[PDB]
Design a protein around this ligand. Structure first.
Ligand code: HEM
Ligand SMILES: C[C@]12CCC(=O)C[C@@H]1CC[C@@H]1[C@@H]2CC[C@]2(C)C(c3cccnc3)=CC[C@@H]12
Length: 464
């Protein structure tokens, strides 16, 4: 007897468990870095913080490419924009101009905190009308963060009830659903093996997004003034005006805006939902957050960015959400721009390189009870200082492809949660259902929809 000819072998079953956890589980057997080959393409998975910092920082510019994928081509109008653009002149310029835009929001009256706090004030007024009811907070949050990013991109915001917000919500959901079935990392290219309409559906969602962004962009050509640079579109059109010209085509500007607009809405809304869900599961933590805000902010005023110096448990809670349920548990796929190496192992040019951030955030040697939600791990024993308990922590990535929206994200998350906790009791709905914390890996790590009972806090009422 003889062993069977083997035509293919994969180390775990496809579509069974979360990909980021399956890869992590493999490290027990093969170590923290290993490879898989599908047809002619090789993918390397990295699951230890030293190798990841080599890829992202030390040799960051060797591994700053993006792999090409059929779905990503459609969302990115063929690898324009930032997030899905390959390393190259177009990416570098648009990333730099996007980053420079955030500097226009450093100080003054258009300061970032002021834009955020005004949209949070409307959100809170809206939620307060639901006093005593159980609601899904997704859309009210989505609206506030959509208005924040719309103001950053264009200096415009949507009035309550504007049907465009429902149009955007609809295509956002459709693009996320069709961009990947689970994570962006897939061992088997199912799209190309069996007949399906995934690409056709994605194109129809992206066409609506593109048509909407095209209308704004064209209408803005009439408003743009060399003498007034106050938002992201101004910044891009100024660079075009002073132009390289080919790298700032209308389609290039549109896709970069769509990347910022899309990232500014989906990332922040998801993290807010996760934070509320963990707090419904951990009432002891929620109780201490009320005490911390009642003692440090009170009700004389609304929370401010400066309050990050005092609401330490709230900052730790957010840090712990981003550790336990990272927005991007495998970042976005990287690619070797040149022949290089990771941990002394050769990596050819063109190899896809995946950083398993989940593995970094759940490494047993780097963290105590990594499966557990414990905001106190980011505080000292007294609870008087924030600490960095581990170097194996990279929620925003690092190096050339690191998140450019980090400052916005941290301010939005902190302010939304501080305003909500000052004003609202947030409780399990009356049928006793808790949110599932298992999550749904998509291009972003989403949580299942859930309801929360909302009540205006008595302490707030008494104080008015
Ligand atoms: C909690 C919220 C967020 C987290 C945890 C987060 C994290 C990350 C991560 C892990 C990456 C990929 C790093 C890599 O591929 O190596 C990334 C990239 C990126 N993020 Fe975020 N992000 C957040 C919110 C935002 C926001 C609010 C925006 C825009 C306002 C934004 C814009 C981007 C862009 C454009 C990229 C692509 C960078 C590039 O490829 O050059 N992100 N982010
Ligand atoms: C797909 C989506 C949302 C849906 C939509 O309408 C189109 C839009 C296109 C841009 C996408 C965006 C989803 C988050 C992305 C992938 C992102 C990101 C990811 C994780 C952390 N930070 C940022 C940067 C690019 C963003």
């Amino acid at each position: 007897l003889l062993s069977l000819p083997l035509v293919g072998s994969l180390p775990f079953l496809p579509r069974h468990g979360h990909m980021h956890n399956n890869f992590f589980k493999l490290q027990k057997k093969y170590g923290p870095i290993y490879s898989v080959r599908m047809g002619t393409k090789t993918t390397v998975i990295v699951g230890h913080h030293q190798l990841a910092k080599e890829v992202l920082i030390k040799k960051g510019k060797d591994f700053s490419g993006r792999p090409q994928m059929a779905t990503l081509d459609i969302a990115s109008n063929n690898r324009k924009g930032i997030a899905f653009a390959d390393s190259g002149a177009h990416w570098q310029l648009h990333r730099r101009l996007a980053m420079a835009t955030f500097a226009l929001f450093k100080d003054g009256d258009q300061k970032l905190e002021k834009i955020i706090c005004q949209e949070i004030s409307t959100l809170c007024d809206m939620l307060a009308t639901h006093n005593g009811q159980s609601i899904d907070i997704s859309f009210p949050v989505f609206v506030a963060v959509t208005n924040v990013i719309s103001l950053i991109c264009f200096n415009t915001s949507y009035k309550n009830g504007d049907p465009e917000l429902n149009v955007i919500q609809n295509y956002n959901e459709g693009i996320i659903d069709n961009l990947s079935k689970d994570s962006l990392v897939d061992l088997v290219p199912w799209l190309k093996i069996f007949p399906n309409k995934t690409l056709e559906k994605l194109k129809s969602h992206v066409k609506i997004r593109n048509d909407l962004l095209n209308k704004i962009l064209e209408n803005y050509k009439e408003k743009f003034r060399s003498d007034s640079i106050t938002n992201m579109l101004d910044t891009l059109m100024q660079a075009k005006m002073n132009s390289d010209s080919e790298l700032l085509s209308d389609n290039h500007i549109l896709t970069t805006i769509g990347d910022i607009f899309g990232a500014g809405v989906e990332t922040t809304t998801s993290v807010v939902k996760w934070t509320l869900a963990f707090l419904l599961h951990n009432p002891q933590v929620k109780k201490k957050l009320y005490e911390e805000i009642d003692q440090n902010v009170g009700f004389s005023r609304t929370p401010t960015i400066s309050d990050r110096n005092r609401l330490l448990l709230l900052e730790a809670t957010i840090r712990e959400v981003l550790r336990l349920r990272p927005v991007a548990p495998m970042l976005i796929p990287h690619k070797a721009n040149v022949d290089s190496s990771i941990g002394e192992f050769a990596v050819d040019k063109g190899t896809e390189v995946i950083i398993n951030l989940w593995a970094l955030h759940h490494n047993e040697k780097e963290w105590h009870q990594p499966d557990q939600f414990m905001p106190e791990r980011f505080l000292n024993p007294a609870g008087t200082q924030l600490i960095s308990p581990s170097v194996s922590y990279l929620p925003f990535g690092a190096g050339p492809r690191s998140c450019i929206g980090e400052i916005l994200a941290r301010q939005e998350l902190f302010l939304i949660m501080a305003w909500l906790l000052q004003r609202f009791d947030l409780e399990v709905p009356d049928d006793g259902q808790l949110p599932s914390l298992e999550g749904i890996p998509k291009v972003v790590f989403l949580i299942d929809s859930f309801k929360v009972k909302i009540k205006v806090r008595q302490a707030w009422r008494e104080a008015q």
